[PDB]
Protein backbone atom coordinates (compact mmCIF):
# COMPACT_ATOMS: atom_id res chain seq x y z
CA UNK A 1 0.00 0.00 0.00
CA UNK A 2 3.13 2.10 0.49
CA UNK A 3 4.38 0.80 -2.84
CA UNK A 4 8.14 0.53 -3.45
CA UNK A 5 8.94 0.16 -7.14
CA UNK B 1 9.57 9.57 -22.34
CA UNK B 2 6.80 7.16 -23.30
CA UNK B 3 5.53 4.52 -20.90
CA UNK B 4 4.22 1.34 -22.52
CA UNK B 5 2.01 -0.99 -20.45
CA UNK B 6 1.38 -4.41 -22.02
CA UNK B 7 -0.63 -7.01 -20.09
CA UNK B 8 -1.50 -10.71 -20.42
CA UNK B 9 -4.68 -11.36 -18.39
CA UNK B 10 -6.92 -14.47 -18.42
CA UNK B 11 -10.12 -14.18 -20.45
CA UNK B 12 -11.56 -17.68 -19.97
CA UNK B 13 -14.35 -17.11 -17.43
CA UNK B 14 -16.89 -14.26 -17.29
CA UNK B 15 -15.18 -13.04 -14.12
CA UNK B 16 -11.85 -12.97 -15.98
CA UNK B 17 -13.34 -10.80 -18.72
CA UNK B 18 -15.02 -8.51 -16.19
CA UNK B 19 -11.65 -8.12 -14.45
CA UNK B 20 -10.03 -7.42 -17.83
CA UNK B 21 -12.46 -4.58 -18.55
CA UNK B 22 -11.96 -3.12 -15.08
CA UNK B 23 -8.19 -2.88 -15.56
CA UNK B 24 -8.60 -1.49 -19.08
CA UNK B 25 -11.00 1.15 -17.77
CA UNK B 26 -8.51 2.01 -15.03
CA UNK B 27 -5.75 2.56 -17.61
CA UNK B 28 -7.98 4.80 -19.73
CA UNK B 29 -9.01 6.71 -16.59
CA UNK B 30 -5.29 7.23 -15.90
CA UNK B 31 -4.85 8.89 -19.31
CA UNK B 32 -3.36 5.92 -21.18
CA UNK B 33 -4.24 5.49 -24.86
CA UNK B 34 -4.61 2.17 -26.64
CA UNK B 35 -1.86 1.29 -29.10
CA UNK B 36 -3.29 -2.16 -29.82
CA UNK B 37 -5.20 -4.77 -27.85
CA UNK B 38 -3.65 -5.18 -24.38
CA UNK B 39 -1.01 -2.48 -25.15
CA UNK B 40 -1.36 1.10 -23.84
CA UNK B 41 0.98 4.08 -23.82
CA UNK B 42 1.28 7.49 -22.17
CA UNK B 43 3.72 10.38 -22.55
CA UNK B 44 5.59 11.20 -19.31
CA UNK B 45 7.65 14.35 -18.83
CA UNK B 46 9.98 12.95 -16.16
CA UNK B 47 10.69 9.68 -14.40
CA UNK B 48 9.10 10.90 -11.14
CA UNK B 49 5.78 10.93 -12.99
CA UNK B 50 6.78 7.57 -14.47
CA UNK B 51 7.25 5.93 -11.09
CA UNK B 52 4.01 7.42 -9.77
CA UNK B 53 2.18 5.88 -12.73
CA UNK B 54 3.74 2.46 -12.12
CA UNK B 55 2.97 2.64 -8.39
CA UNK B 56 -0.67 3.39 -9.18
CA UNK B 57 -0.80 0.48 -11.64
CA UNK B 58 0.53 -1.86 -8.94
CA UNK B 59 -2.12 -0.68 -6.46
CA UNK B 60 -4.84 -1.15 -9.11
CA UNK B 61 -3.59 -4.42 -10.61
CA UNK B 62 -6.05 -7.23 -11.52
CA UNK B 63 -6.32 -10.41 -9.41
CA UNK B 64 -4.53 -12.58 -12.01
CA UNK B 65 -2.21 -12.00 -14.94
CA UNK B 66 1.01 -10.32 -15.97
CA UNK B 67 1.41 -6.55 -16.36
CA UNK B 68 4.69 -5.19 -17.72
CA UNK B 69 5.87 -1.60 -18.01
CA UNK B 70 8.46 -0.45 -20.54
CA UNK B 71 9.84 3.11 -20.77
CA UNK B 72 11.27 4.34 -24.08
CA UNK B 73 12.13 7.64 -25.69
CA UNK B 74 9.62 9.28 -27.99
CA UNK B 75 12.10 8.86 -30.86
CA UNK B 76 12.35 5.10 -30.28
CA UNK B 77 8.55 4.91 -30.19
CA UNK B 78 8.19 6.92 -33.41
CA UNK B 79 10.44 4.45 -35.27
CA UNK B 80 8.26 1.45 -34.39
CA UNK B 81 7.62 -0.72 -37.47
CA UNK B 82 3.91 -1.06 -38.27
CA UNK B 83 2.81 -4.23 -40.10
CA UNK B 84 -0.87 -4.57 -41.06
CA UNK B 85 -2.30 -7.82 -42.43
CA UNK B 86 -4.46 -5.98 -45.00
CA UNK B 87 -2.55 -2.74 -45.63
CA UNK B 88 -4.33 -1.16 -48.60
CA UNK B 89 -6.30 2.10 -48.08
CA UNK B 90 -9.37 1.81 -50.33
CA UNK B 91 -12.51 3.89 -49.68
CA UNK B 92 -15.99 2.67 -50.59
CA UNK C 1 19.49 -4.27 -28.37
CA UNK C 2 16.16 -6.10 -28.05
CA UNK C 3 13.52 -6.34 -30.76
CA UNK C 4 10.05 -6.52 -29.19
CA UNK C 5 7.13 -7.72 -31.30
CA UNK C 6 3.63 -6.82 -30.16
CA UNK C 7 0.89 -8.45 -32.20
CA UNK C 8 -2.88 -8.07 -32.14
CA UNK C 9 -4.29 -10.88 -34.29
CA UNK C 10 -7.94 -11.98 -34.57
CA UNK C 11 -8.96 -15.18 -32.79
CA UNK C 12 -12.60 -15.12 -33.92
CA UNK C 13 -12.73 -17.81 -36.62
CA UNK C 14 -11.01 -21.21 -36.83
CA UNK C 15 -8.83 -19.80 -39.62
CA UNK C 16 -7.87 -16.87 -37.37
CA UNK C 17 -6.69 -19.20 -34.62
CA UNK C 18 -4.73 -21.39 -37.03
CA UNK C 19 -2.98 -18.34 -38.50
CA UNK C 20 -2.27 -17.17 -34.94
CA UNK C 21 -0.37 -20.38 -34.17
CA UNK C 22 1.47 -20.17 -37.49
CA UNK C 23 2.82 -16.72 -36.65
CA UNK C 24 3.72 -17.77 -33.10
CA UNK C 25 5.60 -20.80 -34.43
CA UNK C 26 7.44 -18.60 -36.93
CA UNK C 27 8.55 -16.33 -34.08
CA UNK C 28 9.72 -19.31 -32.01
CA UNK C 29 11.52 -20.80 -35.01
CA UNK C 30 13.18 -17.40 -35.50
CA UNK C 31 14.59 -17.44 -31.97
CA UNK C 32 12.12 -15.04 -30.36
CA UNK C 33 11.17 -15.76 -26.78
CA UNK C 34 7.64 -15.41 -25.48
CA UNK C 35 7.23 -12.58 -23.00
CA UNK C 36 3.45 -12.73 -22.98
CA UNK C 37 0.79 -14.34 -25.11
CA UNK C 38 1.02 -11.45 -27.61
CA UNK C 39 4.55 -10.11 -26.91
CA UNK C 40 7.80 -11.74 -28.09
CA UNK C 41 11.39 -10.49 -27.92
CA UNK C 42 14.78 -11.29 -29.42
CA UNK C 43 18.27 -10.24 -28.41
CA UNK C 44 20.09 -8.38 -31.18
CA UNK C 45 23.88 -8.28 -30.98
CA UNK C 46 24.47 -6.13 -34.06
CA UNK C 47 22.28 -3.46 -35.60
CA UNK C 48 22.83 -4.82 -39.11
CA UNK C 49 20.75 -7.86 -38.15
CA UNK C 50 17.91 -5.73 -36.73
CA UNK C 51 16.44 -4.66 -40.04
CA UNK C 52 17.06 -8.10 -41.51
CA UNK C 53 14.75 -9.28 -38.71
CA UNK C 54 12.13 -6.65 -39.59
CA UNK C 55 12.20 -7.67 -43.26
CA UNK C 56 11.64 -11.31 -42.28
CA UNK C 57 8.68 -10.41 -40.05
CA UNK C 58 7.19 -8.41 -42.93
CA UNK C 59 7.55 -11.31 -45.37
CA UNK C 60 6.08 -13.76 -42.84
CA UNK C 61 3.26 -11.53 -41.61
CA UNK C 62 -0.14 -13.12 -40.95
CA UNK C 63 -3.00 -12.31 -43.35
CA UNK C 64 -4.91 -10.22 -40.79
CA UNK C 65 -3.97 -8.29 -37.68
CA UNK C 66 -1.59 -5.65 -36.42
CA UNK C 67 2.09 -6.34 -35.77
CA UNK C 68 4.29 -3.62 -34.29
CA UNK C 69 8.04 -4.00 -33.89
CA UNK C 70 9.92 -1.88 -31.37
CA UNK C 71 13.68 -1.75 -30.82
CA UNK C 72 14.96 -0.99 -27.31
CA UNK C 73 18.27 -1.14 -25.50
CA UNK C 74 19.21 -4.03 -23.25
CA UNK C 75 19.04 -1.73 -20.21
CA UNK C 76 15.49 -0.66 -21.08
CA UNK C 77 14.58 -4.32 -21.44
CA UNK C 78 16.26 -5.45 -18.22
CA UNK C 79 14.61 -2.73 -16.11
CA UNK C 80 11.08 -3.38 -17.39
CA UNK C 81 8.67 -3.38 -14.45
CA UNK C 82 6.98 -6.75 -13.92
CA UNK C 83 3.67 -6.58 -12.05
CA UNK C 84 2.00 -9.85 -11.06
CA UNK C 85 -1.76 -10.01 -10.67
CA UNK C 86 -2.75 -10.59 -7.05
CA UNK C 87 -6.08 -10.15 -5.32
CA UNK C 88 -6.14 -7.35 -2.77
CA UNK C 89 -7.43 -9.68 -0.04
CA UNK C 90 -4.90 -12.46 -0.63
CA UNK C 91 -3.72 -14.83 2.07
CA UNK C 92 0.02 -15.00 2.70
CA UNK C 93 1.88 -18.27 2.28
CA UNK C 94 2.61 -19.45 5.82
CA UNK C 95 5.38 -21.59 4.35
Q: Where are the domains of chain B?
A: 2-78
Q: Does A2 touch chain B (CB under 8 A)?
A: no
Nearest residue of A to residue B52, measured between CA atoms: A5
Experimental technique for the deposited model = X-ray
State phi, psi for B90 to the nearest 5 degrees. -105, 130
Least CA distance to A3: which residue of chain B? B55
User: Residue B57: helix, strand or coil by DSSP?
Assistant: helix
Compute the residue count for chain A: 5
The reply to whether residue C68 touches residue B80, judged by beta carbons under 8 angstroms, is yes
Q: Which residues of C touch B (CB under 8 A)?
A: 4, 6-9, 35-39, 54, 57-58, 61-72, 76-77, 79-88
Distance CA(C84)–CA(B66), nearest Å, equals 5
What are chain C's partners, defined as 3 or more CB pairs within 8 angstroms? B
When CB atoms are compared, the residue of C7, C38, C80 closest to B70 is C80
Burial class (CB in 10 A: 0-12, 13-18, 19+), B61: buried
- Cβ atoms within 10 A of the Cβ of B23, count? 21
**Residue of B60, B46, B63 lying closest to B2 (CA atoms):** B46
CATH number of B2-78: 3.30.70
Grouping H, G, I as helix, E, B as strand and the rest as coil, residue C3 is strand
Resolution given for this structure, in angstroms: 2.0
CB atoms within 10 A of CB B44: 16
CA dist C83 and B7 (Å) reads 9
Name the residue among C38, C68, C76 with its Cβ closest to that of B81. Answer: C68
Per the document, the length of chain C is 95
Amino acid sequence: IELSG
Amino acid sequence: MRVIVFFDLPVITPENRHNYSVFRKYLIKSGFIMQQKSVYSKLVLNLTNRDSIVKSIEKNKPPEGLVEVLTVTEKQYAKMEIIIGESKTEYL
